[PDB]
Symmetry: T
Subunit: 159 residues, 12 copies
């Protein structure tokens, strides 16, 4: 296909591709974080078992929803969503966290991971605002407000 | 009633009436587009019949929700929503599209119509932002993000 | 090569019935739009009650519109599907800027009276030509709308 | 066991038995048609598989409900509903249609079967009207109105 | 001017409304009888028939509501007192039926009357083009014919 | 059929029959009241039509449930519940109230009827307490508490 | 200081808790008997009674839970072993009841005992102002009185 | 002209009971607000468990508040319906900045103990004057809250 | 290359598919018989058995669908005509059964055949490692064994 | 705890505390308004009783949802939500409104109260925008758009 | 009542009775275990109260369903299921465990009980396999797979 | 001190089975990711049908992943829980940029063929060592996936 000044949804192509690149790095972080959270669910031991087995599942279920919506936003911008483990490991800032078996280590892992997601989502929000990409802005807004609330709760548990 | 500087919801009257005028032109486009989409539903033939009879119904059902919310926003701004076929035909940019019986013509009709809605919604969003009409902005934001996603899907089908 | 259509009915009578059904559809469409207007524009202490009631009514009209268009298709005919087409064919007039409960409610009685008369004429034609599927549709619409006209009129007493 | 002028529901015995006989011939046709449609469901192949495996299930599910009601109407007229494969095969006009594995063959088989059913139901409706058997008439009216709509859809797919 | 509110002939509609009111009286006495069957059943059929009688009177109650509303729709007054119903009904009050067969036979006999009356109303409505009334009768007849088959099967 | 000192539920036969007689008089009042309220539902006209057609249906629906329970309480006491219109008309204090077509008339009819029911239920409650018939007492307690609330609401509407 | 955790008299509450525990023992043996009725029924009443017995034991199980919790609420220990229940119960173990009438009569007789015990507890709770216990008894009595009417109607 | 009120009860006794019920309502209202505070402010590893539990509890209090106000109305009396009114009448004190599970849980035991005592006094008055509808309400509240106090206390052991 | 689409032995799968087709023929004749039992029942068992027969044929229909699909899964052709079924079935057409015991006995005898055939198929599938077919048989056997206990309890 | 430049969710501490202060004043207004609306529900008399008893309940139910979300946003900003009647009475602008028994007085009370909420929410929205507090902005946006719609409806009723 | 070579389901009578005897011993163990677990539910105290009052209810609810199915399997084999407390106490290996009021004691009691049940079920599975009793085998397979998972969870909590 | 594990099975055989199950899990994980890709990247007139179908399929894989990991835990073993671990162990290769229905559908057939073979080997090992819980899991997966492979293949004919 020939390059076009505007994409199918009527946004500037260059600016949309920059946004999609940043969204793809975000998606990489989500994917590694989701995997870590699945591990937290599986591997928890001790008297927090039932509570946190269930909490971690709630948390990764909500991440999975976001992963779906994020890949769709990338497609919506006429860009390619990263869709391999190898690709995600190359791009992610969040590290693989394995053999976390205690509530506090897993919960702190979540806090630290969400702190990266929030930071990256605020940067994307700002960039999207600069060019009037309201669809991308709106998505980041939703993610930020939800995850700020969650970060409050996780930190409350850890006090 | 005497003219007032601010309307019942506490927004500037003049600016609200300008926004309502633009919203009413949008509503006209929605109404003609909805009608076209009902036609697409009724008149589809060939092996895409079941799939697209159902898809077109999904699409016009979602448009009807938006039409409802848009007329209510106009009322909320203390303005009059256009509420006649004659009025809508005078104001709409989207043309009446009749006797579309094939999937591709109908699907392309949708793409082209949504492209007008998105363009008009972005203009309204910008105007609303200029005066701090957050309620109107928020509505446009919702419509844009949803319809961008749909435009991606429709164009995917057409590839 | 055959005097009958896809579903096995006489083609000429089916086209005659489809034409009548299309004129009925035009009336429904203008009527539905008027009713949307009644819903949006109602003011005064009847606001919540009638905002809800008018929504119930136009919702039910919408479903009937669906079924009518499909009945026209079922008779191998073309359903009208444009505002410009409906305005040319409809007897029911556009009714705008009705903001008072009694105005709007009387409008509904007046429109359903037109629909009922039209539906009865179609029912008679369908019955005498053996189009039971069209007759049955008209029967459902008539019985439901007679009940509704009783209620609307009751409210207006 | 003594012959009676009127049956338990108060209709003429002779006229009701004639109607029951015609309804039993209808039931025979439904049953072979149902079996054929089950076959269409099971045997479809190629890219229409998911869509038509589902659509054929919808269709035979609806036929099954009509078979139930028809048999009960025959019982309601104080008559014996046919209830054996061998009986149905003797009485049915609709033939067994096996090894239909493509959409068009199966869909055309449905149009052809419904065409027979419609004709037969109209004949029963007319007979029932002659003697005032409203309960039988009303059943035929329901079946005709629903199957006419279906035939429109099936034919649309085949265009 | 020549028709009632719903566009039908006034004289014909009043005649139909009168017949429907007599029908309503019969339904009301029958419903009461069936409540009694529900309450008073004894024996090993208790659970099954206590439930079955409730199902039957529940369906009658729905029909009663629709009948009254059809009368109102025809611009007539639905009878709405026990004393009015007792004057108009053909179905007799049936008390102290405690046996499954007695109560079930009672239902068969009562439905016989409803079906007969409904068929007469259907015929008259058809004659005069009152499709809304015809359609109601048609629904009631087809449902009750089915029920009469079932009740009689139980009694065999 | 031999008279017994105690009934099947283990209460005194004589005292239970006296309670059953009072409950039957209550049932007679409920039944006439229910019929009146059905009439109010059917016959309302004017601008209260939708609101009161609905409210009267709610009210008679609740009465019907109480009629069911009362009759079953009478049976539970090994007594015969009245089950004929002619019986109810002989025993009821509440009179037939026909051709009530306006909100105030019908709503005042409900206040007046419930006032009779409340008085009667309180008398039965007191009698049941005298001999320890807790099952009857508990039924009256439920009916009183619910109908007092209702009377407040009906009277509020009438102000 | 003068009352237990919930503000009632300690001695009175212990007396009520003891009676409630004896009640619990009876419910538990009765529930077991009713499970057996469900499992072992034979004959043409199989489907109806297999279902009806399940309904009855399901409701008993709910009452068992509430009883134990009321005992706990009174700061007492609910009995919670088969051996304890067998020592305390008046209702006897009923095994190998395979006939509808035998099992249904068994239910009538068992409920007779529950109702008697519940009425005694109600009286004592009323005397001492234990409304929470009174209210529980009231609910159980009214429900079971109804059931006893139904069971006996079936047996007529 | 009559010593009795709309619902047929003695007016003097009904006003006495309504006054007591209003003081009960005041206590409920302050207690509900404290419980909202417990829900918002809990910290530590009991966070999710108690955030949920405190919500369950104040939700149930809210429903009881509804019903109490309506019972007061039903007795032809005026339900208190202002914060300033509740603070003047309540015995239960405002309890703020409770961030620890045991603090908050013990607060709940302490408040329900006050409610139970108050409800028992009303129950007794209602029973001796024949106000069965008020008695019945109190009965429901007492039985439910005795069970709850058992549970809360159990958690604290 | 050595296996069918799902990775099983072709010859073994065709042998299993043949047996499953004979099973399908039996289910289809049995289902038809059970529809007849539902329609034709008379007497005081009418409501209970009209319902019970419907429950039983509903469950058979589900099994029929799964059987045909298992045959297809094994790359074979499911029989799909009445004339094919009548040629293959061992269960005979049973018409004009109007009595509860006759129809219930009919069900017992038919399930006897299904269970026997299912056990043979299970054994063969186990021998050849066709776990998917084994698992289907296992489910059908366990369900139908339970049902046979219930049907026989009713007949006692 | 030592003062920190940024809070747990990664926002500037000082700016977040200013926002939380404004949010707490908003919460005070909500709480007094909710209480007033409960009074409106309880105390309504006359023929609007059923309609407005139900409407006022809808309205206070929706306020309660907002109160919950607002206190959680304050916590999310690492601030203390006001949680006493005394505190709310000190901070609120909306006055206690008691003994409102007529539809128009209660409905006007609602209009006037919502007008304060909207005004305060727009101010908070603006402040939050100035520092990029998107989570707070998004909440205000939701509240404004919903309450503007409601204000339209309430004023419609009052016309 | 005459002894038969095969039972009603068509299996060997002798082998089925041996299996029924082993299943009855299993049922005895389930019943004592269930009673113990009910006790754990009722008697828990301390800060695990809400979590374990709920978890123990889940566990005994599941046991109850298995008790139902086991008894019915025994009946299906034409055998008499034990159905008395005194019978269960004679046959059970699992002992009565009363006055368990702490999480660890109760949770360890569950591990110990399930360990007995698993061993017993494996023995029955093996016996059933010897003679081709697939229906009994399949029941044991379900119980084993579910209880192994449970034991993992209970042990995790205890770490 | 014992040759058996927490759930009563032989520790050595349980570790052998857990290792095989972990390699199965690795395959599932790569396969699930490929299927997500198929869902996101499909284009052409099969878009809606396959976007839905691929979602149904990866949803079902996700549940199986859950259960597999838990079965590994149940055997007192460690489930692999990192992308890097799965890529080292998986036989199924990453399959990216599949935008055509037939490509993606054939990919699914090819992957399920690998899973089925692997599951059959585990089933055999579990059966011969008496691990009925593992055998049962494999049985469920095999029967469901054989049916799915029939359907997918049918679509491709
Ligand atoms: Cl990639
Ligand atoms: Cl206009
Ligand atoms: Cl047109
Ligand atoms: Cl036959
Ligand atoms: Cl009258
Ligand atoms: Cl009587
Ligand atoms: Cl004990
Ligand atoms: Cl106040
Ligand atoms: Cl064949
Ligand atoms: Cl504060
Ligand atoms: Cl025993
Ligand atoms: Cl790993």
């Amino acid at each position: 296909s020939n390059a076009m000044a505007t994409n199918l949804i009527g946004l500037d192509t260059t600016q949309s591709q920059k946004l999609a690149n940043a969204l793809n790095n975000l998606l990489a972080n989500y994917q590694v974080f989701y995997m870590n959270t699945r591990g937290y669910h599986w591997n928890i031991q001790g008297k927090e078992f039932f509570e946190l087995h269930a909490k971690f599942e709630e948390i990764y279920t909500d991440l999975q929803l976001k992963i779906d919506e994020l890949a769709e936003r990338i497609l919506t911008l006429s860009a390619r969503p990263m869709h391999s483990f190898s690709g995600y490991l190359k791009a992610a800032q969040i590290k693989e966290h394995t053999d976390s078996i205690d509530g506090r280590s897993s919960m702190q892992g979540l806090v630290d991971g969400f702190s990266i997601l929030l930071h990256q989502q605020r940067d994307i929000l700002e960039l999207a605002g600069e060019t009037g990409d309201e669809g991308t802005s709106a998505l980041m807004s939703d993610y930020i407000r939800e995850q700020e609330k969650l970060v409050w709760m996780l930190n409350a548990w850890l006090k």
